[PDB]
Each structure stands twice: as C-alpha cells, then as structure tokens.
Design a protein around this ligand. Structure first.
Ligand code: AEK
Ligand code: AEK
Ligand code: ZN
Ligand code: ZN
Lengths: 364, 364
C-alpha cells in the first residue's frame, strides 16, 4: 500500500464513495471514525471496534499527551501497539479540547500544571503517538463570531497550517509514512471560507477538513455553510467534517460532499442510556422497556442485538453496571457503521437521494 | 444428562477431582464459581466468562430479587435467558447479604422498603430465577460466637434446612430439574459441626456446603475447622466452601476435601487494581509498572496477557477507564480458572501435595 491514496469509485450529486489506502489499511468512505481515550473506544476492546466495521479510529491526543504522555507512549512502541489497534489512526491536534476543556498567542496556546501547545509541538506529539493521519494545529473559532474576529482567527489558523506543514515535512519518518490534513475556518462567512480554502490548497495537504462547525450554530446554518464551503476544497482529496454528528447530520453532510466524520455522540449517548435505532433514538432507562424482549433495534446486525434484550440492557443501565455501558456502546458504534455502509452502498448504486429521504421519514 | 450426578475420578489424601453432571452441563471439580450481579461477572460478557474456563457461575439472588425482581426475571424467561448464560447457575439463598448488607425470627428475616425472606420465599425466588443448584436458606453465624449462640443459630439453620428441602420438593419442576445443597453451621465447635452434619444428612441433600467460615477467623482457624468438619459430610457428595477465597485458601481447602468455591475477590481485587500472578498479587497502579511491557503474568494463557502490557493496564486503571476494569477482571477470573485446572490435573496425576508446596513457595 501507498502512504496515502484517495480514490472515488462513485458519485451522486455532491456525494462520493471511495477508499483511502494507507500503509496500515484501507478506509472506506464516507467514513465514521470512532473516538477514543486510551481505549480505542471507551468500554470496547479493539477487536470489538473492528467487528462493528470501523476502518480507522480517532486518537484523543489531548488526553494522551497529559497521561500517560506522548514521549512515554513512543517509548512503549507507539499508540498502535499500546492500544492493540493495528489499523489507521487519525489524531486530533489537541487544540479543540485545550480551548474547550489558557492564554492564546501567535506562538500557540498556553494552558494548565502549565504547558504550551503550538503547531510544532502538536505535530511532534502526533508523531510520537505514531499517527497515520495528522491534523494541522488550528483555532476553532467560537460561534457566533463577528466578521473581524472570524477573519483574524482564520488568518492565524492559516499561518499555523503552514507551520504544521513545515514541521511535518521536516520529520522524514512522518513525511514518508503518515498523511497531513489542513483545516478550513472562517466561521459562517463565505468570503473567509474561500480565503481559507485558497490558503490551504496553496500550502497543499493530503486531505481537507471543514472546521469551525457543530459549535452551536444548528443544523440549518451548518448545512448552509457546508453548501458553499465544501465545493471550495479540492475535489480530488477527502473532506472531513470535524465533530459531526447525529445520524441526520451525517446524512445531510454526505449530501454536501463530506467523506469523513468523528463524534463522541455514540459513546456518550450510549453510556447515558440513549440507543440509536432506525426509528429514532430511544432511552433504554425508560420504564417502557423493563419487560421488552426485543433487541435495541429490529434490524441491527450487531452482536448486542443478536444476544440481549432491551429489558436486560434497561436493567444494566439503571443498575450502573459496566456491562450496560459495554453493550450500549457496542450497539451505537455498530449502528453508526451500518449507517455509513448504507450510505456507501446507496451512493454506489445511484440511490442515495432516495435513501436519505427514506431514512429521514422513518427516523423522525 | 441427569438432573445431578457427582463422580470422583481421582483422589490424593482428602483431595478429590471429578465431575458434576447436570442437565445444562458438566462441572469439573474442584471448581471455582465466578460471582455475578445481573452480569455473569461484572464487566464481562458471558462468552468471556466461559472462555476463561468457568463451567458454572454464582447467581446473586439478593441483588436480583430487589431489582429487577425474581417474578420479572421469570416472566422474561428466567436468569439464563436474561443473562445469556446457558450453563449451570448456582444461586445463593440471599440471606448472607441480607444479614450483612433487619429483624430475625423463626419464620425468617425481615429487612429493608421492607420485606421478609424465609426459607420458603428463598426457594421460590431461586426457582423463579431458574437456578440449577439451589442453596438452602440458613444463618451464617457471626464470628466470634459463644457456644450457646452458635448452637442456637445452628439449630435454627437446621430447622430452616428441613423447610428448604420440603419447599424444594413440593415444587415438581424444581425437584426434577435442579439440585439442592444443605449448609453446615456450628461456628468453630466440633460438636456442633457434627450435630449439623448429622442433621443435614438425615434430611438428605445433593451436596453439602461448609458455612460459617471466612467471617473473620483467619486462615489457621478456618483450616483447623475444615480439618474436622469436612470428614463429617457424606464423602460421595460435593463439598462447597462458601465465600472462599484467596488462592492460598483454595489450595489448603482442597487439601482438606473441598470441591467447590465462590468468592468476589477476583472481581473486586481486579476492579481495584490488584492482579493475581504466580509470584503473588501485584497492584498495577504502582508506578513501577508505568513502562513495564510484560503481561500481567508471564505464564498466564488469558487473552489479556496475550494482547496487552502491564503498562497499558496501569494507565487504564489510573485513568478510571472501564476497559481497565474489563481487562483486570478477565485476567483475574482466568487466573482463578487456571489455578483450578492445575489443582485438578495435579490430583489426577497424584502430585497435588507437591503442587501445593511449589505453589506456596513461589506465590509467597
Ligand atoms: C463537536 N463539535 C466540534 N466542532 C469542532 C471543530 C473543530 C475545529 O474547527 N478544529 C479542530 N477540531 C474541531 C473539533 C474536534 C473534533 N473531534 C476531536 C475528538 C478528539 C478527542 C475528543 C474529540 C470539533 N468538534
Ligand atoms: C466471604 N465469606 C463468606 N462467608 C460466608 C458464609 C456463608 C454461609 O454460612 N451461608 C451462606 N452464605 C455464606 C456466604 C456467601 C457466599 N457467597 C455468596 C455470593 C452471592 C452474591 C455475592 C456473594 C459467605 N461468604
Ligand atoms: Zn445492535
Ligand atoms: Zn492473564
């Protein structure tokens, strides 16, 4: 396999389906990337994550850089060996959680013990973790933002994107074996999104993320911004929407040209008792499920739905049992993978628009 | 398979190895029975519990009778279907936790919402759960106890044992498909243990437990009491030591004629960071393990020891990750199963005394 190859096998409107080939494996697009901790996903073994159909996971750089430490993980053989996940891993730059979870400067961000995270350190940390897809270090502009603040922020991010590029390229091992994605900013403003797209393509990346969304604007506004923003990115490279989202968000985003997604929702939801189904989410804690012998979802192919009832999982979750978290998480991640499979196959067959419509009608 | 058949295949001194055949499967003795919740074991899938080598699990009657309720579990198809464990389950009578975790009378025990647990209700609850091995309802005498209190308590327990027997036998389905064990009491007093053994054998049970130990007396005293107490039980029936114990306790108990064990230690320990090894327990939280790439135990055949390092599990546990609980629990239950396998094979081969000595020398 090559370091990085994206191939589009089929199209429908702005939607695309294909594959990313990397040294550690192939990624089917549109892709959902489960988000971890030190665990590939909370409460799942790597073999379980794979079994649900994931081709790639998102490594939680912010968590790992604090404990156990990136240097330590490198000393131990890198994140893949540590975790026991031998397929691709995309690492976040760690800035979103830093700024979310502090003193900003052109150098980077200082945060509390106290540390500085700059584009160079971020790229270095991702290298130490042994990331396959490295994210440039950026600033996710708060929402709402005035045009001036949005432009200032975006401009800084583009300068950081160039620093990210140069840091990546100066490291031979990383440059030859990993890929680097740039992230578009500009809040909700068409002109700033265009400037950002142009700056990133001038620098040149292996893939392009749409940043700065799913930060409070709501689905209509996010879709409006995606409508003009994704066509500004190079068509022949993958498009990654960061931090999205609910099933309906993912479908509408694919309709707008997005190829890759990450979100904590299936795990967070699941730990909290929310299960995804083709008829909408359900909250398994509700008394209505205490004697319901049906699986979480009637059609789901996951091991959980093959083996246990709603009634059992209802009891586990109300009792605070770890096994309830395990089973809910496996189901919800499997559900997300089945959604992505359905999306890929429908695009491949030229019937994605009908799938999107049937999906929504039933889900809502 | 028969309802219940115990066969002794080999002996060494007072130690025995054999099998219990039941309708839902065969149990290799000496046996360790992992203890659950609504989960066969906390943080494990039933398939994982089986994979570690368990032939039978202990159903936590006290927990289940409160939530979700025995009637509900019966409505849902019984505990085996609810949990997804299709092999034998031994259920506790629920009194130990009631008295541990209240107003005592000849009828039973009342406890807080408020309820009464009597021998008849206990047998009924175990029936509703669909237990394969039913325990008589008894009183675990506190330690220390004066001879008069020990005798009073023991006498009551023997009366409850007869009520337990009659309640079990009056229920046709239970009598034909499950087994019933009686429990010996008498604190540390030889004469009361003998009276208890005699009362139980006069009633007649499928197996006999040694109750009233591992309640604060310490290993020397427990072994002293086992020395005279186990030979009082029928030789041709299984001997169950309730609530024991650490690996060293199990070995010494088998040397004294015990065939079956239950304890929460491998799960509790494991969730707390204690891993069992052939060189003794280790606490994986200790800084000494933060960069140790060896498995939890050098010889262990479990999936955890095949796949992850001490260093990784150290991080998981310190981070409070569910996956750390999962992995520690799987290892410790596997460790207990491997100990029991080593015990069975050494008895079978006539070298249990040498195994007991090598085990202790290395473990301590
Ligand atoms: C939910 N909305 C959301 N919006 C986001 C915008 C951005 C951006 O503009 N740049 C970078 N990252 C962004 C992120 C982070 C995406 N997930 C990172 C995971 C790693 C471990 C835990 C989370 C966003 N998330
Ligand atoms: C640790 N010492 C100990 N000593 C015990 C004496 C007795 C007795 O004399 N009779 C009955 N049960 C007894 C028990 C209970 C044995 N485990 C039951 C499990 C079900 C779910 C959680 C625990 C004892 N445990
Ligand atoms: Zn499912
Ligand atoms: Zn192990």
């Amino acid at each position: 396999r090559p370091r990085f190859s994206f191939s589009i096998a089929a199209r429908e409107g702005k939607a695309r389906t294909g594959t990313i080939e990397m040294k550690r494996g192939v990624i089917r697009t549109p892709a959902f990337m489960p988000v971890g901790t030190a665990a590939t996903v909370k409460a799942l073994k790597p073999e379980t994550v794979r079994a649900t159909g994931a081709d790639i996971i998102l490594g939680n750089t912010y968590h790992l850089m604090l404990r156990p430490g990136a240097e330590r993980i490198a000393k131990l053989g890198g994140l893949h060996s540590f975790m026991g996940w031998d397929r691709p891993i995309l690492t976040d730059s760690g800035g979103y959680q830093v700024m979310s979870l502090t003193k900003q400067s052109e150098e980077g961000v200082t945060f509390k013990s106290r540390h500085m995270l700059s584009p160079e350190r971020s790229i270095e940390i991702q290298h130490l973790l042994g990331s396959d897809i490295v994210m440039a270090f950026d600033e996710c502009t708060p929402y709402p933002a005035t045009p001036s603040r949005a432009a200032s922020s975006m401009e800084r991010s583009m300068r950081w994107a160039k620093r990210s590029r140069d840091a990546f390229d100066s490291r031979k091992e990383q440059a030859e074996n990993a890929a680097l994605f740039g992230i578009q900013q500009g809040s909700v403003f068409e002109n700033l999104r265009q400037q950002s797209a142009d700056a990133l393509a001038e620098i040149g990346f292996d893939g392009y993320a749409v940043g700065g969304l799913a930060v409070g604007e709501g689905q209509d506004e996010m879709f409006r911004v995606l409508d003009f923003s994704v066509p500004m990115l190079p068509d022949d490279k993958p498009h990654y929407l960061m931090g999205v989202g609910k099933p309906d968000d993912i479908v509408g985003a694919v309709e707008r040209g997005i190829d890759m997604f990450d979100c904590v929702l299936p795990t967070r939801s699941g730990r909290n008792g929310q299960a995804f189904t083709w008829d909408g989410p359900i909250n398994i804690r509700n008394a209505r499920f205490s004697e319901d012998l049906k699986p979480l979802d009637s059609e789901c192919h996951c091991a959980v739905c093959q083996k246990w009832s709603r009634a059992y999982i209802h009891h586990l979750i109300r009792a605070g049992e770890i096994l309830g978290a395990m089973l809910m998480t496996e189901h919800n991640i499997a559900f997300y993978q089945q959604l992505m499979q359905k999306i890929r196959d429908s695009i491949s067959e030229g019937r994605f628009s009908q799938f999107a419509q049937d999906f929504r009608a039933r889900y809502f």
